[PDB]
């Protein structure tokens, strides 16, 4: 499923993402935008280390979900990576919450540092009613 901007904003707010571990809703919106373009079925194979990024938040199989083919990987979210490819983002959101519970926080995603950190991210949520 490819979410429309405000539709996603409202969904994330309902799932409790606004201010989760100090991360504003607009930061989550910026992250999803640059990681997948708000596309839940996005997959990205990393030839360099044999891991794959799954779903709307492009969560990596090396540490967060199990896909069985990633060497020396763990499954901290305790989920099959298949769960992060559903149209319903509940599981993806629960896992993202797990990721930011680590000390790096939102910084765990390099794309956030490049395109969201220290920027005016208000644009991602303007006019959505959240
Ligand atoms: Cl699962
Ligand atoms: Cl599994
Ligand atoms: Na894994």
From Swiss-Prot:
InterPro entries: Glyco_hydro_22 (IPR001916), Glyco_hydro_22_CS (IPR019799), Glyco_hydro_22_lys (IPR000974), Lysozyme-like_dom_sf (IPR023346)
GO-annotated molecular function: identical protein binding; lysozyme activity
Catalyzed chemical reaction(s): Hydrolysis of (1->4)-beta-linkages between N-acetylmuramic acid and N-acetyl-D-glucosamine residues in a peptidoglycan and between N-acetyl-D-glucosamine residues in chitodextrins
Main localization (coarse): secreted
Pfam family, one: Lys
Catalytic site positions: 35, 53
Subcellular location: Secreted
A GO biological process held by the record: antimicrobial humoral response
Annotated Gene Ontology cellular component terms: azurophil granule lumen; extracellular exosome; extracellular region; extracellular space; specific granule lumen; tertiary granule lumen
Keyword Hydrolase: yes
Cited PROSITE patterns: GLYCOSYL_HYDROL_F22_1, GLYCOSYL_HYDROL_F22_2
EC number per UniProt: 3.2.1.17
The keyword rRNA-binding is assigned to this record: no
Residue span(s) of domain C-type lysozyme: 1-130
Disulfide bonds: 6-128, 30-116, 65-81, 77-95
Sorted UniProt keywords: Amyloid, Amyloidosis, Antimicrobial, Bacteriolytic enzyme, Disease variant, Disulfide bond, Glycosidase, Hydrolase, Secreted, Signal
Subunit comment: Monomer.
Family, as annotated: Belongs to the glycosyl hydrolase 22 family.
Connected disease: Amyloidosis, hereditary systemic 5: A form of hereditary systemic amyloidosis, a disorder characterized by amyloid deposition in multiple tissues resulting in a wide clinical spectrum. AMYLD5 primarily affects the viscera, and the predominant clinical features are renal dysfunction of varying severity, and intra-abdominal bleeding. Inheritance is autosomal dominant.
Functional note: Lysozymes have primarily a bacteriolytic function; those in tissues and body fluids are associated with the monocyte-macrophage system and enhance the activity of immunoagents.
Other facts: Lysozyme C is capable of both hydrolysis and transglycosylation; it also shows a slight esterase activity. It acts rapidly on both peptide-substituted and unsubstituted peptidoglycan, and slowly on chitin oligosaccharides.
Name of this protein: Lysozyme C
Organism of this sequence: Homo sapiens (Human)
Gene name, Swiss-Prot/TrEMBL: LYZ
């Amino acid at each position: 499923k490819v979410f429309e901007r405000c539709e996603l904003a409202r969904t994330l707010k309902r799932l409790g993402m606004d201010g989760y571990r100090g991360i504003s809703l607009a930061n989550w919106m910026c992250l999803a935008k640059w990681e997948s373009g708000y596309n839940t079925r996005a997959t990205n194979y990393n030839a360099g280390d044999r891991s794959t990024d799954y779903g709307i938040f492009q969560i990596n199989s090396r540490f967060w979900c199990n896909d069985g083919k990633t060497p020396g990987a763990v499954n901290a979210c305790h989920l099959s990576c298949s769960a992060l490819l559903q149209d319903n983002i509940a599981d993806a959101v629960a896992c993202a919450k797990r990721v930011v519970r680590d000390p790096q926080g939102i910084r765990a995603w390099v794309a956030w540092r490049n395109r969201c950190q220290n920027r005016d991210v208000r644009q991602y949520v303007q006019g959505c009613g959240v």
